[PDB]
Every structure is written in C-alpha cells, then in structure tokens.
Paper text:
[name] ([name]), in particular, is a powerful restriction factor of retroviruses that blocks viral replication by hypermutation of viral complementary DNA and inhibition of reverse transcription. The lentiviral protein [name] inhibits [name] packaging into virions by targeting it for ubiquitin-mediated proteolysis, and through ubiquitin-independent mechanisms that are poorly understood. To target A3 family members for ubiquitination and degradation, [name] hijacks a host Cullin-RING ubiquitin ligase (CRL) complex and a transcription cofactor core-binding factor beta (CBFβ). Here, we solved the structure of wild-type human [name] bound to the substrate receptor module of CRL5 containing [name]-1 [name], CBFβ, Elongin B and Elongin C (VCBC) using single-particle cryo-EM.
Two-dimensional (2D) classification indicates that the complex is a dimer of [name]–VCBC protomers. Second, in addition to RNA binding, [name] self-association is required for its packaging into virions. Our structure indicates that [name] binding to [name] is mutually exclusive due to its ability to self-associate. Whereas [name]–VCBC forms dimers, within each dimeric assembly [name] forms little or no self-association. Nucleotides that are 3′ to the primary [name]–[name] interaction site may template an additional copy of the [name] E3 ligase to cooperatively reinforce [name]–[name] interactions and ubiquitination.
Residue numbers in the entry:
A (entry chain E): 8 to 46, 54 to 112
B (entry chain B), F (entry chain G): 1 to 176
C (entry chain A): 1 to 381
D (entry chain D), I (entry chain I): 2 to 80, 89 to 96
E (entry chain C): 7 to 156
G (entry chain H): 6 to 156
H (entry chain J): 9 to 46, 54 to 112
J (entry chain F): 1 to 142, 146 to 381
The structure:
RNA sequence: AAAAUAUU
RNA sequence: UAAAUAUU
C-alpha cells in the first residue's frame, strides 16, 4: 500500500494537457520510457503539454493492455484503434516512446 | 527399455491445409521472387517412412525446417487429422523445436518487407509510407503502440496468393 | 462479365481431350478433373440410358468434385425404379481423391444395387500411403462396394473419342508413348491393389518339367529389400508380378519382354542412390539374350541395386542364351534355380491360395537338381 | 481479474481487481488515494444508485463486461458524468 | 535465463501444468485390439506411438530412432517403461522447446489408454548444450522487424 | 431521274459495345438456355455493304430485328462512334423503327423471367417469391407501385453474364 | 387519331418534334473544303451514304442508297432531296415509321457549314394506307408488360 | 378553386393514425379504389389501416407517377426502404397502386 | 414546376407551382383550402418565420431542393413541426 | 490462391505454343494474345540486347494489350540511349486490333529512329473495313513491316521463346495451306502490287523466252447488279507459284491451285452472280485445267474468265484440258495491248509511268490468238 | 464445323 | 523431362 504523496507512490498522477487527471501505477508508466526517466524519485506528478484527454486515456488503456499481456502469448485479444485517432495516437506514442 | 526413440511435437493438421501450404510455398519460390532462397524436398528425398516433405528456410547462418508427415495413426475417426506438422530450428548440430507463432516471427525477421524505420517520420509529416508490412503474421504478439497505430492508419497489403504462414498452417481448426 | 463455372458439358473438344487425358504418369498443370460416365441396366449389352461429362477442379471444395456431383445426381435419379440394377462406367482423367474414395466407399456400401467400374487415364497421388489405403478399402476388398478400378487402354481411349468428343469425321490418333505409359500405370496399380495370380495359372506356368508344350509367355514376380544396420528389411510396398506384353498393332508392335517392363518400372520407385537395395526376381523362363544384355547394362549403370534372379526353367536358343547368362552373371547378378523352398515362397506370397497349402508336382526335386547342374555347367563353361 | 476505470469531476483511477471483490473492497482500494472514509464514499453505475453492499455477481457484471480494452465505467461521489475530450 | 523463461512465461500452449493426454492410434478399432496393439508397440520399439492432449492440437510422437537415420547423441535418457507398475506405462522424453531444454514426463494406464503428462525443467542439459547456438537463438528470438529496415 | 433512298434510324455506338453485345447474344444463345430461339446472321449472310449482323427475336407473329453497321464515315474525329445500331419491327409487309427502351420492354414480354401473378402475396405471407425478375430493362417505364414495392422487398437476380439489352447496347457515353 | 394523339402528347422516340440542330459528320478529319465537295457529290450522285447527327445526342439519320437494300420497298409517300430550291441550302424529306407512328422528317443543311436544322411532322397520308393488323399488334406489344401476367 | 364545393381541387384523406392529407382529384384518379369511391357528392376518404407515414409515401407515389406519367427520358429514382417496403406493398395492394 | 409541402396542425397539402411564384401566390393557393385571408398567414422554413414578401430565389431554394420524391418542407402559421408516424 | 493475371513470362510451354500459334485462318477460343519480341541496334548479326514475351486477353482494356504494354515499357527503356537507332521484331499470335494499329502508327510516327517488323500467325478480324483501313495506314504508308509467319519464323520462336528441351519442331497438319491462305489475304488487304521489272519480264507474249519457270496470276471480281457489272474493290490482288520446298510444299503448288484454295474464303453469296477475271503469264496446265473445270461445275454462281500472255503446251494434254474448261463455261482469251496496259496500271506500282509496249506485241498477240482460237471449236 | 470473350 | 492449385 503506497501513498502518492510518499516516495513509494504506487500511483503516479498524470495531468492531461486538456485538463483531465488520471492516476496509474508506477510500473505501468515505467513501460513508457519518457515517464520512466522522469520518475526524479522526489517527484510524483507529471503534466502533459499537448496530449488531449482522450489520447491520454487511450494510452493508459494501452499500458493496462501491455502489462496484462506482456508475458501472455496465447489468444491475445484485440486492441481498438480508429483512423480518426490514429495519427495523434502515433504522435503521442512517439512522444512517450510506446 | 533397450529400444530407443526420437521425440517430436507434431501439430495435427488436415491434408488440405498441407497441400495449400505446399502450393503457396512453391508459388512464392517460383512464380514470385518473394520466397526465393527457400528449399523444398520431395517425399522421396528423405528415408523417413512418414516424412511427406521438408521446407527449409535459411535464416542467416541458421535454418528453419518445417516437416509434414503421412500415415500417422493419429488420424481422427473421420480422418479429419491424419497428417501433421513440425517446426525445427537447426544450426549445425544444434537443434530445437519452435512454436508456430515464434516461427513466423523468425521468418518475417528476414524475408518479407516491413515498415522501415522511416515510417514513423513519414507518418508524422503526412507523407506516403513505403515499404510497408505485408505479412501480418510476423507481428502476432502484442506490438508497441506505435506499430498498432501505424497499422491502423495505413492498411497492410493483401497479397494474392497469401504468403505462407506457419501459424495459419498449424491453427487448431477442429478444436476452434 | 465472365460466365459461371460450367460443369455439365455434353462433349469435349479434341484439343481438350488430347490435353487432359494424356496419360503420362507424372503430369503437372492438369488442374482439372474430367469425368465421363455411362449408366446402363443389367441384361444384353444395350445403349446406355444416360451418359454425360462432369467437370471440377482438384483444389475446389469436396462437395463440388466431379465424383460427388455424380453420386448426388444418382441418389435422386435412381428413385424412379428402385428394382433396377445399374451398371455405371467412369472414364476419368484423375483417379478419385482420398476423401472422395472414402465417400464413394460409403455410398456404394449403402446402395447394394450399383456396380461401379472406373477407368483412369492417370493415377492421382499414387505414392500417398493414405490414398493407397483408401484405394485398397474401396477396390481390393471383396465386401460391399466391390468397385472395380482399371487403367485406360487404347480401347477405352478410342471409346471416349467416339462417344465423349466432338470428333467430327476424324479418327483417333494415339500420342507417342501410350503403350509404355499404360504398362507403367498397370504395374503401379497392381502393386497398390496387391493383385495375386489364381492357383491354376501358377500351376500351369511354373512347372519345372524339362519337356513342356503350349506356353508362350513368361511371368516375373519381384520383391525389394533395403540395407540397414547390416540387415535386409522387406519394403512391403515393393511387391508384385507381371507377364510379357505380346505384340499388338495398337500396343507394342513387337511385344515387350517382361524383363524390359520390369526395368522400365524400376526407375519410378525413386530408390535412394546413397543406400543399398536388393531386388529379387522369380521368372518362369530364363532371360533371353537381348533382355539379359539390357539387364546387365542396367545393373552396371545402377550401383545401388543388387539383382537376384531365380528361374524355374532354362529357355535356351542358339546357345546365345547361355552367353547372355554369362554376361549377366559377370555384370554382378546372382542367378539360381527355383527349388521347393522358393516355389513354396512364391506360392505363399504371389498367389490367391485362399489359405491352401502348396502341392508340389512330381519330379520337382530331381528337375531342380538337374537344372542346377545345367546352370552350374553353363556358368563354369 | 478485471481492470476498471473510475471517473468523477475530471479525476480518474485505473486499477485491477478480482471478480468476487465487493463494492466494499472497491471503496477500500480507492481509499488509498482519495484519503476519505469508505463508508460514505458512493459509487454509481449507469446513472443507477448502487447499495452499500453490492457484489459483482448480484450486480450481473462479468469479465466480459469489463475488459482491459473496454473497462467498465462507474461514477463516484462524496459527502457529473464528464465526457472525454474530442478531436 | 532458461529457468526464468520456463518459470515466468506462457509456455508454448502446452503449459507446465499437468494435463490429461490420450492415445489416439487406431481410433476406430475395438478397445481390446487397441490396447493389445498399444502394449505390443510399447514392448517392440519398431512403430510410432502418439499421445495427444485432449483439449488442444499438440501431440507428442515417438518414432523409432532407426527411422530418422544417423543417431543423435543423447546425454539424457528417454524411455517407455512397462515395469514400474503392472497396469501402467511411464513415459520420459527430453526435448528443447523455444530454446529452453525440458523433460516431458507422463503416464498412461493400459486399461484406459489415457493418462497424465507434465513438463519439468532440466538444468543438466543446459550447461552441456553449446553456448554459441543457444546464445544465437536467444538473440534471434528477442528481436522484432518493425522499424529495423534502414 | 432523281436518286432513290431508304431512310433508317441509327444509334452511334462504340465497336466494343457491339462486340460485347455479340458476345452476350452468342453466349445466351448457346452456353445458356435462355436466349434460345434468337436467330443470328453473320456478316456474310446479307448483301448490304454496311450491315455487320442481324439478330432476330420472334415475338409471336411479329419480329424484332436489331442490326449493327460497318464503315459509316460518320465516325467521330477520334472514331469513338464509327459503327451504328438500329432496331426494326417487321410483320408481313409492314415495318417500323423502335426505341431501345421500348425494344427491351418488347423482348422481355416473352423471353426473360418476371414476378408472377401470385408473387405479391408471398410478400405479405412471408413466403419466398419465385420466379423473380432477372431482366430489369424490360420494366424501364414507370410501373404500378405494387411491382416497385415487390422489387424493393426482394432484390432482382443478377445473372453473369448480363442478359443482352438494347438499352445497354445503345446508351450514350460520349456526352450523355 | 390515336397515332396523331401519341405524336402530339408523347415523349417522342427521344427525338422531340421540336426543331433540332443537325450537322453532317462524314470526313470529320479532312479539311472543310474537301468535306463540302464530298458532301455535295454524295448528294448529287446518290451512290454513297450521308449521315446527319444532332449535336447533343447519338441519334442520327442515314440516307443509304435504295439499291443497297436489295428489294426496292414500296413508297406510298415520296422521299426527296432538294438542291434546287435555294443555291446555298440542301433540303431533305424522309418518311419514316418511329415507335409505330408514321412521320416525315424535314430539314435543311447549309453546305458551307454542312450544318443546319431539322424537324419532325405528323404523316397523315400513309397512316390509313399501311396495313391494319400490324399497327394494332405493335400497339398491344407496346402496352403489355411482363409483370404479373404469367400464370 | 374552392374547397367548399364537393368537386374540390383536392380530396381529404384521413390516416389510420388520425392524420389528414389532401391530394388532387386527378392524382387520385390513378388508383382504382379511390377513383371508384369519388359518390360525386362526397369529397372525403377514410382509410382504416394505412398509417400516416404510409399515406404520405403512397401520396408521394401518386405525385411521382402523375409527374412522370408520360415522360420516359431520364426518369428519376424512387427510393424505397425495406423497413417500410412491406407495409407500402400492402397499401398499394389495397389501393391498387 | 415543383411540388410543395406545408406542415402544420396535422395537415398537409400537395400542389405543383412555378419557381418564380412568390409567397403571395402560395398563400393564394392555400386560401382555396383554409378559407382564410393571405395577409396574416405566415410560412416557415427550417424553423424560421418567412416574411410577408419573399421569393424562392431570395430564399435560395432551387428545384433540386424540391423534388417529386423529396419536396421542400415548410411549416405554416395562423392568427409545431409534427413528425411523421413510426412503424 | 488465385494469383493475378500473369502478363509476362520468359518462355512458354510446348503445349501452349502449339495451342496458340496454330494458324488456322478461322480459329476460335484463342482468347489470349502472345507477343515474343526482340530489340537490337541496327548492327546486324549480334546477340539481341533484350527479348521477352508479353501476353494479354483480347477483351481486356486497351492499356493491358501486349502491344500497348510493350510500348509503355519501351518508352521508358528508350531514354537510356537517345542517340542509338533500334530495330524491333515481333512474333504475335493474333494480329493487333484497330485501336492498337492506329496507336502504333502514332507511336512510331513520334519516334524517327525505331524500325518495326511484325510477324503474325493469324489475322485478327481481317474482314472488317476499319481494321483494313487501319492496317493500310500503319504499314504501307511511308515503317511497320507486317508479315505472316512461315516455317522459318515458327522454328525460330520454338527454339528461342519456348522451354522445349531436346525437342524438334513438329509442324501441324495443314501449315503450308494455311500460310499461303493468310499470305493471299494479307496481300489482298494491303493492296500489294508487282514491281515494273517483274511484270515486264513475266508478261511477254514473245513466243521465244528464257527463264520462264514461274507462273503468275492476277485476279479480280465483279458482281451483278441492275444488269450491270460492279467492281468489288476487296477482291483484287495477284499471286505467284510456290516452288517445292522440304519444309513447305514438297511439290510446289500451282498459282491456279492457290487461287482455287483462296476463292472459297470470299463467302460469295450462292444466290448472287459473280464474274472472276484472271490474267496469267502461262496458260493453265492439264491438272490445273481439270481442277478449274470441276470447281466451276461445282460452283453455279461463279463464272471464271482467263486471259493469258502465252500458251503453255506440253505433251498435248493441255489442249485437252482446255476443252473441258470450255465445256464448263470458262472463256479463255489472250492478252492484247488494252489488257496488258490494264494489268500494268492496275497490278503494278508503276509510279504513274504509262505502259511501254515492247517490239512485236500486236503480232505476237495475233499469233497467240490464231493458235488458241481453232482448238475450242476445231 | 469454328467469321471468333460460345471463358473446355 | 513435370511427384503435381508452380492455374502459360
Ligand atoms: Zn511486418
Ligand atoms: Zn475428390
Ligand atoms: Zn526377352
Ligand atoms: Zn422482368
Ligand atoms: Zn490490341
Ligand atoms: Zn499448272
């Protein structure tokens, strides 16, 4: 049981550029290189300058997907993606190195 | 005891899947240049009483050998599954059986064209992407969000005939 | 734009017939299956009550294969007269497939009032163990279907050209190697279906009495064995027999010799060059001179085959047969004579003896000893 | 296991839990972040008021409903279903 | 690394968890003939014997070592035993799967012709196996094709 | 003595459209069993220096004659429209030209299948409607709403190759 | 009366009775003087074919020599071409039977442009002269429709 | 034209749902049932079953057919949807459209 | 000519008129049915009241907008856009 | 597993080569068109710098036709060397189409340094006026050299553009008859004419000659109409005797025999009356005369008429044949100044030169007429 | 027989 | 010089 205020946060705070805040476990963000490097151990909050709220929601869902199925290699399920969101999702992934 | 054996993992497949595999591999070995460099041994080129063929795929200095078998008593009551497949990875005397999904991952690592490193930058600048992945079976694991987004925005190629996929060959159709 | 697949033609064009039915045992690019058929009632040989041509693709779906289409049609067309005995004759470019053979077996077992004869231009996947088992279960077995299978000869090709081709004011012109291909296919199919002689034929021919009469043929029975771990293992697949093809205007003008037919079929076994094989032959008459010369040449070229000839009698003419035997032996062949043991083995393996025992004829041992002495003298002189 | 997202007043938490876990366990889990007693903290589903004691099975929700690629959405309140942003 | 791969991985679709397998040969034949010829083949060592997991498509096929040809050196002992228990057959088969060496162990009851099987790790074969080939395979399997073409 | 002429109506078409018509007419005359009874005359079976073919479609007493034509100088600058088509309605002495749409409505009076009298009922009863119209050019006019609704409920048959139609033969392409 | 009513109140043949611009098409590619000379010669001799097309449609009128048709067709009405009424115009008169109704197509072409105008008019003379049964047969063929007729 | 007189320019058509449209007499003449119904003293029509939307669609068909009763050049399409096709078919059958 | 639709108080009238016809002519046409003076009556389009003096071209409507299969829709007022029925 | 239409190969299978290039003048179901091409600098007798095969359906779109695809590839390949002149050789099963012929004309008129030779197994739609006009514009106008394929070209294609292994070319049954029929039809289409020297040599009525070992035949037809004769401008041409050849005809056919072989193709109406006028350097021999007599008896409609420049009498049987010819109705005459001039102006590319009569033309004509006249009645 | 996309 | 859906 980790408290976000403490060093061993166990739930890093993400602030969407749009204005929405999510929170996700430390390892889930560790799967993303930029946040991994940023989190430095004395900080527990990351703010995004350009990523929309929906983009950050989808990348968090992707973190969940990857951590759930990083080791699994059997009958992987589908991960929704749409053309209208695809370009900005690619940009966000490049920024976060997903 | 006192009678030795050799032990192999044999995916029980249908005969129609086997010849479809044979047709596709030869097609891309002769009609198209895609599978050029692959070898295909006929049934009479191996002493094994059961081996029906052998597709050899050079992977750099190692090799990937896909074998089919005939006359196995394992055929279902309706003979839905009389024949079988096995994937091997041989390097000199060393050898190891391989899973169909990892087999295609190792295949696509060398032979079929795929999104180059420039794909990300070209998509960022809104430019047309080429070359692009055409063998969807080489990325059947959980790929990086990058690749999933790229595959979403720009569709993969659909070759005709489809490239030989080891996963499609050994997919459990009767058990679904 | 492009019309739909046509599968019920009435007759096929001359180029089509010449292309599809070319009976080379190993033909590629013939991705289509043609099935001419005739249906008639039991009684005096009369005009067929129906006859058409079904067409299909080898890589299509089984329900569309020509054979399954015919059986689907028959299952309905038969309902008109449930008390009618039906003889069906197929002339097909490719032998039915494994699944279709099994389905035909089930169909024919279900219907006990149908007699199916099949003539095949070529054998389709004749080297597949599963297909061989399916053919054996369909034809070889004397129960249920008793479907008969045969290779197409000049007569059947001519019948098709007359009745299943738009052959207008023209006569059938056989392609080059029709007889050789026919005999190769016949030997292979007999090897598959495990054909065996009737007892009377073996009793009549394989008599070792030195003085004989009225026997114008030569019979050859062959088996093969493989070398492994200093042991000879019988290739149960390689086992059969054959008889000389007498001269015929349509077939071989100068009838081919059984030895030459055997040497023509050996190459199709695709024996390994790096292994060692032993081929054992039992012949009713000793090789002639030309045969023996060829056989010696063949043995010289093929270093992986060790030949073992056995003979029930010696056929000698001009003394040149003795020369032929001398050159054959010098080539490396092992020539011997058939004794009680060999006669019994041939009876057990190559005859439809119905479990019966061997009944040696009179003077067998004395004749065997005399012929052994004769062969010893011939090889030593 | 099922992954779930809780949303309220432009705040969110992504967290995994078991199937047999009851709503009491959910409030206990969110206690680690919200720093408020769980007895009062109130959950909502489909604009419906969940009772203080509420188990997954009697709720009817299943692992099919809540997926990593489509987690179930539930609101939170103390003592406004805010839609996501748009392109 | 091999032990870690065998321990903390989803393995080949044939998990180390014990699973029920069955003998599939002679599917059609009456039961008595099936079991009789099973015992005969197990005693002989001249034919092939196959064990298929009930719920999947994977199966283990034992071929006589003479069929393949040139014998492969076996630092580990594989066997089919009919002696430890009267009414059951023990099966031990070493293998290399996805680069990690394992031993597939199992047993089949003669009366039922179906039994159980499990997959155990093998450290012994690991150190003796060549480092060059195993390192090459480890390098080859970790890589991916995306964004590597220059 | 002044010259004498015969006056006819010709529709400028492309040689490719004439070819396809020929193909369709032949096909459905021989390969199929639909257009049986259609008579076709080759280019050497008529003395006219320009005629290319004549398709006769007996309609009871009357006869519909569709003719194509060769070597008309009227061809366009790019020779988009060198050839020509015509339709005539011969009965005894009398003859007359006809419109392409009226010509398909005339041929579809006796030749290709259409909703039967009882076809409407099955729409309400939920049964299967048969026969269904396979030639949609024979109803090019505005018909009763019952037929339109029935056609909307059940899609028309699409035959391959399409039934030959005078409309599709003599439709405008250059400028519409 | 029915024929006249149809002509007056029908969408007529796709070739409306209203005046329409027509032009001569032969020898498009050749220069204008050659085209003019060839058109005049074709009109005079009566040996070649001459075709007049509306500008905006694919319909055109072909004047084949009556000899090509083989058996000369009886002509109760006269078809004619004037090269005499005006020096610079060529006039045409073509009796035809379009969609079951007999009409006269009239028109003029200026030879310099080899173009001009044409119109359709109802033909009263031959309507009663033509056979009776055939006209009603064509009218019934034009009225019936396959829909819901077969039993 | 005046609606007070029985020979009005249009005719009342009350829908089963309880909705009234009005359509020209000449347009209605295209249907046998209404043609026989319109009797010259009456100028109203009551439909037991036709829904309001079905009535609107059938009236649209009358308008289309009267507009293109004679013309046969570049005839426009008549959109029809399966969800309404069956009830429109029943309405046409009743009205002989 | 174009066929027009008027939509008010559970009534509708079907009539063909010239494009150049002004709203005054439309009111004259509907007077034959409504038995009311043209002056006070006001039309509506896209839930927008139409002035006493207006023309089709000024409104921007064209013969393409009003078709024999999809006529232009306009409401009416005297001194509620009722939707069609449903299956 | 239905690969896309393979429109290019390197060599074709023997069965394909035999089934497609079989050159019957009226052949059906050869829906594909094959085109084996070679390119080479104007320097002769050196290995070609490129040679391949393009194939395509007839009923496809014009851009997929083998000719258009070859020109599309050639336009790009030509930019490599703009200073080099090229010769291109085609061997095509079906003859190009009208559109393809026109567009090839345009393409080659664009390029002033590319020569094109074409060989055809069969003529595609050889009885369509526009195709005839298109070929006339493409070939004769002056460079596209359209020819028919003979034994030599067939053997060349078999050797170079087929996978045949240790195999020798085996001509089908009627190869020479079909070749000569196609040659005659192509000559009729293109409107070939004799060179002045050839006619001057081969049409001397002078009884004493040297080297007269070849027989010519210049034909034309006339149709009945309104009790009048109308020239069928299609039916005009000439031909010469084919010498015996080992691969061609073992016993060379006589020009008259080729004429009788081609006449049936014209599909002359059985209910129409036709007059066939012929001019020949030598009078028909006995076998030719018998064949003409039997053919004319068989054909009611045809009416043959023969004009000759010399009377070929040998062993006296020819005069006997003339009697049966006359009984059949074939009128035989001699060539006078008027007919000599007509042949010169009609069947020679005289370039507008007027006929120049030789010495003793009238006297020789009178002598031949005197020799011929008595035989028939006397 | 083939007048030729009659898709054998 | 076909081991065969390498659909020329
Ligand atoms: Zn890829
Ligand atoms: Zn089959
Ligand atoms: Zn012999
Ligand atoms: Zn219809
Ligand atoms: Zn072309
Ligand atoms: Zn001669």
């Amino acid at each position: 049981y980790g408290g976000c205020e403490g060093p061993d946060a166990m739930y890093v705070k993400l602030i969407s550029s749009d204005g929405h805040e999510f929170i996700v476990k430390r390892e889930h963000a560790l799967t993303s290189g930029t946040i991994k490097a940023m989190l430095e151990n004395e900080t527990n909050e990351v703010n995004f300058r350009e990523i929309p709220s929906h983009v950050l929601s989808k990348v968090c869902m992707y973190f969940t997907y990857k951590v759930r199925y990083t080791n699994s290699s059997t009958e992987i399920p589908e991960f929704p993606i749409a053309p209208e969101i695809a370009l900005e999702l690619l940009m966000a992934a490049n920024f976060l190195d997903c | 005891m006192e009678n030795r054996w050799q032990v192999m993992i044999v995916w029980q497949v249908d005969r129609m899947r086997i010849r479809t595999w044979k047709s596709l591999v030869k097609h891309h070995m002769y009609v198209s240049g895609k599978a050029r460099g692959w070898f295909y041994r006929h049934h009479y080129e191996s002493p094994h009483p059961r081996i029906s063929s052998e597709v050899h795929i050079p992977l750099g200095d190692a090799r990937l050998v896909i074998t089919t078998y005939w006359g196995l008593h394992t055929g279902e009551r309706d003979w839905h599954l009389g024949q079988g497949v096995s994937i091997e990875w041989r390097k000199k005397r060393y050898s190891t059986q391989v899973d169909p999904e990892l087999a295609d991952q190792l295949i696509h690592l060398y032979y079929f064209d795929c999104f180059s490193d420039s794909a990300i930058r070209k998509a960022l600048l809104g430019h047309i992407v080429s070359p692009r992945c055409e063998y969807q079976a080489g990325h059947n694991k959980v790929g990086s969000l990058q690749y999933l987004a790229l595959a979403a925005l720009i569709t993969p190629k659909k070759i005709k005939p489809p490239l030989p996929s080891v996963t499609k060959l050994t997919e459990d159709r009767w058990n679904k | 734009m492009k019309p739909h697949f046509r599968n019920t033609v009435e007759r096929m064009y001359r180029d089509t017939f010449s292309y599809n039915f070319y009976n080379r045992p190993i033909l590629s690019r013939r991705n289509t299956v043609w099935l001419c058929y005739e249906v008639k009632t039991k009684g005096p040989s009369r005009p067929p009550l129906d006859a058409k041509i079904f067409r299909g693709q080898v890589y299509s779906e089984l329900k569309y294969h020509p054979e399954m289409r015919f059986f689907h049609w028959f299952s309905k067309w038969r309902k008109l007269h449930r008390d009618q005995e039906y003889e069906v004759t197929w002339y097909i470019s490719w032998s039915p497939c494994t699944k279709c053979t099994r389905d035909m077996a089930t169909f024919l077992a279900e219907d006990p009032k149908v007699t199916l004869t099949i003539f095949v231009a070529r054998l389709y996947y004749f080297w597949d163990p599963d297909y061989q088992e399916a053919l054996r279960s369909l034809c070889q077995k004397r129960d249920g279907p008793r479907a008969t299978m045969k290779i197409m000869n000049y007569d059947e090709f001519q019948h098709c050209w007359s009745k299943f081709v738009y052959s207008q004011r023209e006569l059938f012109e056989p392609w080059n190697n029709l007889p050789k291909y026919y005999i190769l296919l016949h030997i292979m199919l007999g090897e598959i279906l495990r054909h065996s002689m009737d007892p009377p034929t073996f009793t009549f021919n394989f008599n070792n009495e030195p003085w004989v009469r009225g026997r114008h043929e030569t019979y050859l029975c062959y088996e093969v064995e493989r070398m492994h771990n200093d042991t000879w293992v019988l290739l149960n697949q390689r086992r059969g027999f054959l008889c000389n093809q007498a001269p015929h205007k349509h077939g071989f003008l100068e009838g081919r010799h059984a030895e030459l037919c055997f040497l023509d079929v050996i190459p199709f076994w695709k024996l390994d060059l790096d292994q060692d094989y032993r081929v054992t032959c039992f012949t009713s008459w000793s090789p002639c001179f030309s045969c023996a010369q060829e056989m010696a040449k063949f043995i010289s070229k093929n270093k992986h085959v060790s030949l073992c000839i056995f003979t029930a009698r010696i056929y000698d003419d001009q003394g040149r047969c003795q020369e032929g035997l001398r050159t054959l032996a010098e080539a490396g062949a092992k020539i011997s004579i058939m004794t009680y043991s060999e006669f019994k083995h041939c009876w057990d393996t190559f005859v439809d003896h119905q479990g019966c025992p061997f009944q040696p004829w009179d003077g067998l041992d004395e004749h065997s000893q005399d012929l052994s002495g004769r062969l010893r003298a011939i090889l030593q002189n | 296991d099922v992954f779930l997202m809780i949303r309220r007043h432009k705040t969110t938490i992504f967290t995994d839990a078991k199937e047999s876990s009851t709503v009491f366990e959910l409030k206990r889990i969110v206690e680690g972040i919200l720093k408020r007693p769980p007895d009062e903290q109130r959950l909502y589903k489909d604009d419906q008021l969940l009772d203080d004691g509420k188990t997954l099975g009697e709720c009817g929700f299943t692992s099919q409903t809540a997926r990593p690629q489509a987690p179930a959405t539930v609101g939170l309140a103390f003592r406004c279903i805010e839609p996501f942003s748009s392109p | 690394d091999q032990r870690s791969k065998f321990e903390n991985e989803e393995f080949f679709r044939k998990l180390s968890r014990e699973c029920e397998i069955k003998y599939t040969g002679f599917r059609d034949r009456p039961h008595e003939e099936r079991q009789a010829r099973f015992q005969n083949a197990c005693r002989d060592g001249r034919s092939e014997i196959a064990f298929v997991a009930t719920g999947t498509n994977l199966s283990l096929q034992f071929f006589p070592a003479s069929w393949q040809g040139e014998q492969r050196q076996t630092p580990s002992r594989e066997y089919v035993d009919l002696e430890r228990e009267a009414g059951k057959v023990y099966l031990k088969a070493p293998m290399i799967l996805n680069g990690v060496c394992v031993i597939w162990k199992g047993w089949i009851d003669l009366q039922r012709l179906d039994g159980m099987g499990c997959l155990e790790f093998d450290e012994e074969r690991a150190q003796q196996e060549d480092a060059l080939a195993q390192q090459a395979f480890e390098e080859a399997r970790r890589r991916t094709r995306e964004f590597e073409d220059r």
